[PDB]
Amino acid sequence: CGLVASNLNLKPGECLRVRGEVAPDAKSFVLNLGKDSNNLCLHFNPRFNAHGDANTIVCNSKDGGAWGTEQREAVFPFQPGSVAEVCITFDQANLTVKLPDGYEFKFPNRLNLEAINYMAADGDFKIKCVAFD
Amino acid sequence: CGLVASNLNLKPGECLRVRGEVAPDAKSFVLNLGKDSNNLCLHFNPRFNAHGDANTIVCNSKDGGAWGTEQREAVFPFQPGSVAEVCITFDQANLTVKLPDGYEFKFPNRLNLEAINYMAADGDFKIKCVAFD
Ligand SMILES: C=CCO[C@@H]1O[C@H](CO)[C@@H](O[C@@H]2O[C@H](CO)[C@H](O)[C@H](OCc3cn(Cc4cccc(C=CCN=C(N)N)c4)nn3)[C@H]2O)[C@H](O)[C@H]1NC(C)=O
Ligand SMILES: C=CCO[C@@H]1O[C@H](CO)[C@@H](O[C@@H]2O[C@H](CO)[C@H](O)[C@H](OCc3cn(Cc4cccc(C=CCN=C(N)N)c4)nn3)[C@H]2O)[C@H](O)[C@H]1NC(C)=O
């Protein structure tokens, strides 16, 4: 398992920056943000080659242990064997995920969290730096 | 309390860099490093004015929940209401703590830890950035 951080107290409008190395043979990696492992306002899962998906960003939420409705994006600004930075902010309506190569997208904030306190990384992504503005 | 991080997977010789904000009314702050909350190879407690200490860094270990013997350092390159970076590395014998303004000291690796997987901050120090070299 990857880096797990709690007590982040990330408030609306604040920016969470995560930079890591994508494994040369990476198949997928995960960044989870929320209250705890059962309450995720963002499950961010770029799949290079996993679950039959190729170069697809899979996003979902988890509310009291229940996965929400999966959504998929249409751009994949990740390459195996390279450094990638992911930058995330949220308000009550949406999380805004900013990725390399200028790409940005929004994911509905389906939970009722006053602040993002929990982050967990998994998969083929070696965290090198985490910043809270 | 402050930020808590697990699964750090910090190995001997690797450098953990922590940048944060010392509160303007700082009396004391803490950075704990170890295997988990009950097994700390470093309890790093700069005291501006707390527990009878003035401008003194107090270090200790915790072994299966039992505090070790405190060690008091000779330098204190910290100021209230400022940004400070601490950089930690370790090996079989010692942790090396590098401080602002070129100061550093060593603290024995009392638990003989070969990996640091846990970090926690408390007190008047808001972590803004954590990097792994
Ligand atoms: C016709 C519809 C088919 O229906 C499918 O149904 C599956 C199960 O419901 C979904 O799959 C699930 O989708 C969820 C989001 O919705 C989560 O992603 C979940 O994973 C949870 C999870 C697992 N993990 C561990 C982990 C994750 C990534 C890498 C590693 C690695 C590595 C070893 N390497 C290292 N250490 N370097 C480990 N974390 N979170 C995933 O299984 C599919 O998407 C979905 N597909 C579609 C098209 O709808
Ligand atoms: C009894 C008379 C004299 O004898 C003293 O006896 C004390 C208790 O045994 C020792 O003190 C203890 O020493 C330990 C190391 O060995 C730990 O440091 C421990 O603290 C554990 C601890 C507490 N915490 C939370 C925390 C720590 C610092 C600041 C804040 C907070 C807040 C509010 N501000 C915000 N939010 N901005 C919160 N973390 N670790 C500390 O109490 C003193 O050294 C010792 N002094 C001397 C000179 O002998």
Side-chain angles (χ1 to χ4, degrees), chain A residues 28-30 43 45 47 51 58 60 67 70 72 122-124:
Chain A
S28 70
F29 73 84
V30 169
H43 163 79
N45 177 207
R47 297 176 180 177
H51 301 86
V58 174
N60 206 345
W67 287 111
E70 193 173 291
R72 301 184 166 202
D122 210 346
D124 308 319

Side-chain angles (χ1 to χ4, degrees), chain A residues 2-3 9 18 23-24 26 33-36 41 43 50 64 70 82 86 103 109 117 127-128 130:
Chain A
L3 181 72
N9 193 30
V18 180
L33 304 176
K35 178 179 180 179
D36 56 32
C41 57
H43 163 79
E70 193 173 291
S82 67
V86 178
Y103 178 64
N109 183 2
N117 275 308
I127 306 252
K128 300 303 299 179
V130 182

Side-chain angles (χ1 to χ4, degrees), chain B residues 13-81:
Chain B
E14 301 179 344
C15 185
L16 176 69
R17 306 183 192 273
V18 181
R19 173 170 53 83
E21 294 174 0
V22 184
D25 60 339
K27 302 285 168 47
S28 172
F29 77 82
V30 170
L31 292 182
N32 290 329
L33 302 171
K35 183 174 183 302
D36 54 37
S37 65
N38 299 290
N39 296 275
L40 305 181
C41 59
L42 176 58
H43 166 79
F44 173 77
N45 178 206
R47 296 177 180 178
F48 300 87
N49 191 279
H51 303 286
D53 285 296
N55 297 338
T56 302
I57 299 174
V58 178
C59 293
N60 208 345
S61 57
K62 183 183 274 190
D63 192 351
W67 287 110
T69 295
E70 292 176 340
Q71 175 180 288
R72 275 170 172 70
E73 308 303 328
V75 295
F76 196 87
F78 294 108
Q79 302 176 135

Side-chain angles (χ1 to χ4, degrees), chain A residues 10-11 13-18 31-33 41-44 85-90 94-99 105 116 119 131 133:
Chain A
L10 190 82
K11 301 172 70 171
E14 299 184 348
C15 181
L16 176 64
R17 300 184 157 86
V18 180
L31 297 180
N32 287 334
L33 304 176
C41 57
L42 179 62
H43 163 79
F44 173 77
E85 184 181 30
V86 178
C87 306
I88 299 170
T89 183
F90 81 94
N94 296 283
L95 296 102
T96 301
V97 183
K98 295 173 189 184
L99 298 181
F105 72 92
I116 292 177
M119 171 180 48
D133 46 40

